[model samples]
Target: MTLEVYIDHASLPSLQQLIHIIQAKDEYPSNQRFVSWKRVTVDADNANKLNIHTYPLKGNNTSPEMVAAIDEYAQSKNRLNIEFYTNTAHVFNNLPPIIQPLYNNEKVKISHISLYDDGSSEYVSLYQWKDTPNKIETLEGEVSLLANYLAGTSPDAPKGMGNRYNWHKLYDTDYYFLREDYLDVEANLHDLRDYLGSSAKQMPWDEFAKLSDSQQTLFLDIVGFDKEQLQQQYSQSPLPNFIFTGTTTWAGGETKEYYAQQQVNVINNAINETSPYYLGKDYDLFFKGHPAGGVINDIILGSFPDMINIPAKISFEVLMMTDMLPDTVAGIASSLYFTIPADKVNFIVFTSSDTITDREEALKSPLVQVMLTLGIVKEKDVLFWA
Candidate 1:
């Protein structure tokens, strides 16, 4: 059997593009009429919703902590060959045993899909290219790790940092760069391209789109988007003026609790009478929670019970296509902004402190700098609460 492994943590819209790239990478053996597919992700529940055999990853233990237990149901070593695909190629830097060359000396090919952020759970470390050797070493020096060892106490560091720490290392593969579209990515923001396998190919977007109608249908079935229904939503008037995605509410202990409450407060202020944050009380406001997040609806509703919520399956991307998108997408430090058209929406950012302090903190964030760099938001465009 020949198998294809697609590794990703992509959001709803971007995942659609991922499958298109996979179709471009489809290589079938002449003797075999068909091949097998394995989808890998951190969001298994959502994957289940889409009806695919999605594999879960363990980051720290082996980095990619990570990978094919496919051997468990193996028919035989003679029967199988594998092809892997992922944009998070850094995880493979460790070269887990499963990906090592076959005893007969055949190399496993890995196709590099788009590196754009999908605003998934892996969002924070996904785009923060601080994993470069020079940057990591410099940051390491700023901390006194040896002092903690001397004091007989463990230095507080990121637990399991998973594949993040060694992401700068090189990994071998035949890289496939998708050149045309998907997430409308900015010109190669990071140096990640420099580390892929020795040879590569540029797979244009038009080529993927024209591959085959049945292939496109396979992807659409997995993503569950109805183009006709989406068109109907586009014709409606009185669209929402503001839409909010769930924050990490009551999830990361005290820090997240504080952050979520601040987001709640910001929404309240935005619609209140005469408040500087008043967003014009004339239109509807909507809220939607992330699927993996816990008790989010209850916490958000505890603040404003009447908040009209978009269903869980209807992600922000759906809203964008359906013309349900608001002019203002409000939330606290969400990477979702990376997926949408930056020039189209006003990014109203929220913070955990009072008005003045929140504004100060917002101005100091690396997100603000990157947002400006990507034209995701303009100066004074990202509002804070009063």
Candidate 2:
């Protein structure tokens, strides 16, 4: 039997945890196994550590020829049975209908696993032949819409409500796993509650608003640190000595003229309006560009004339380990907003509207509510540009 693990794009820590679980499972033989993205095998020699030159799923598209090559490799293994493992529910829920045939072999089994911030994880067996396609809009429609938005090819792309649109066309099992199974993992995973709202119900923003203040606090508390703890940590050891901050912009390839201008305008406008907030002053502003860098960083440097540039491609969590800790961190809606030691450094967030015409977009972001619930930044701190 060949065990195939399908891993979605997740944080490095989360992926490492999943890998650790598979390594600890003595029942599965690592050498005969394979791992892939969407079952398109890229590496055949499975081991505790992954050694690969290319990661196709890191981007939006993978070449058809590469996929064909992977499929051929998988078939040549000649295993009598194949079991699939994944942390994502969509592996069984939203895959193309062509995949249903795999279940007919009876030798195929699928399971879902999730990692939690509390240093624990959980697993659940998913039905092999669910046949439940996404009940929402057409996949092609959503894909095209998302592509246009990311590519800056649509007028509606930067608009408020649409800025944070849920373009995923998921099946019932996807919801079942996220809403129920995820809750089973740990109580602190409540941060995901807003992310896993009912598919058939009101917009996620509306549903989240219905949650009471305490409920909202519980959601923010999922970050696993409170103001007092943050302050104590700060006074004792202190976080990395640098101002750990990052940026928000369009996708990589889309950082062309028009899109670049739009990105520049938003940040510039916000900085100009908030004259009191010195952005790019004495402390060299370390504007960490997205991993897949392109014209995005170029535009950012051009917009801020005085700041010294540093090429920081590391994640916010990694930055905290260094001796360089940020005095104040700011971004439009950064993941760092949730985990950063709030009591130590000034954390400023630019409302979604600050950079775009749509105000509701940033206002309704789960992170904004998280900032409020955690009592890190007040309404005034959620800055506006224009």
Candidate 3:
């Protein structure tokens, strides 16, 4: 039996953990035993322990120490073909030395998997930054919007333009811009494509366009990005009385500050009996912070002392599977609102001055379209206080 080692840099992608573990048990073959390079998050409140010995190297960098750790880990398990892994191609190429020990067998494959359905995978695919002896993939569905944002075709792009500089913002790496000429648009895509294509057994982008519209949609996520929904059965979980989710923009300045204040006002109104959005004295309320972490926690606590706090690490998609979800969920343009089924939620009092205008269009930006399209949220919904 061969061991499957899936490696990720920094923290593992949130939903991929749930997808990988569940697949290991039911989808993957018995001949392949899967092992993760980092912590596993298979459960909602209690994600479970790895019990495997972890390496000291923090990320996928190819430093001498990391190289040795990869070598040690590979030797520890008698697996073959460096293909039994995944993540970025830059990481694979730089860490090429580890292949010396395991160049002996087949079923060798690894993928540069994008946990983000946002534009990162689109950037990676469009710019051809992903390397492989295997394949490349994302969370699933059409990334055309985010890709448009990355290609500068979408007006919502930063400064009305897009570039690889934003790659760091998403994947937390600038590894793709190693060249001084990385920004030389027309040439960069083909150049990097050839560079990455040379080592890959599977041509990720070269063959992507030919995939059937149905098959292509899975990789792009245009078909509702369903992988994040609950796959594990949950007949026993408690729903929260009231749920409020928000955007990470709460911490930024300038244009973002306006959105933050909008979020602040919504929070205020939810607890105010005089406001139409108020959930009332008899019901309980919970606040789930942005995953990116915000500076307004203490302030929110000060404003609403009774509000229960949901850990920022906890994924709302996971909560949907549990009874911890509240019947009424209100938020200020958060992506979490996109993941839940609209039928399951009860908007206390929603306003439709709505994704209302073009500036608000950009303010709500690209991914907001996902929730809007799925019919989960409106141009803005569940109470647009503005």
C-alpha positional error of residue 221 in candidate 3 after TM-score superposition, expressed in Å: 31
Candidate 3, 1-386: lDDT as tens digits: 33444444423132333344333444444433223333222222222222222333345433444446555545555543332333443333232334333334233323232222221233334333323223222211123433444344445422211232223232323232112122233343444444333232211112324445543333224112233232221112343366677655433243644555566688777668897666545456567766554565445545576666665555555454323455677765543554455754544222334345344544343344333433555543434333
Q: Compared to the true structure, candidate 1 yields what TM-score?
A: 0.58
lDDT accuracy of residue 260 in candidate 1: 54
Task: Give per-model TM-scores.
Answer: 0.58, 0.46, 0.47
Instruction: For candidate 1, write residues 210-321 as lDDT tens digits.
Output: 5477655544454455544434443354655556677665323464556556667777766778766565445456676665445555567678755655555544554453
What are the lDDT scores of the predictions, listed in order? 0.46, 0.39, 0.40
Summarize candidate 2's per-residue lDDT along 1-386 as a digit string, tens digits: 44433333333232333333344344453433333343122333332233222334434223343334435544555543433333332332222211233434343333322212211111112111112243122333454554454444563432221121232332222321222433333334333344445431210112323445653333223222233433344444433322434454543444355554654564454355455443434343345555444676677667776543444344434334222345666655555454455554454545323345454566544545545645557665665433
Q: Pick the candidate with the highest lDDT.
A: 1
Better candidate by lDDT, 1 or 3: 1
Off by over 4 Å in 1: 10-18, 21-54, 59-81, 87-90, 93-97, 101-221, 224-241, 250-264, 276-282, 292-294, 299-307, 313-327, 353-358, 384-386
| TM-score: the better of candidates 2 and 3 | 3
What clash pairs does model 2 have?
240-324, 240-325, 241-323, 241-324, 241-325, 242-324, 242-325, 242-326, 243-326, 270-385
Worst lDDT run of 10 residues, candidate 3, spans: 133-142
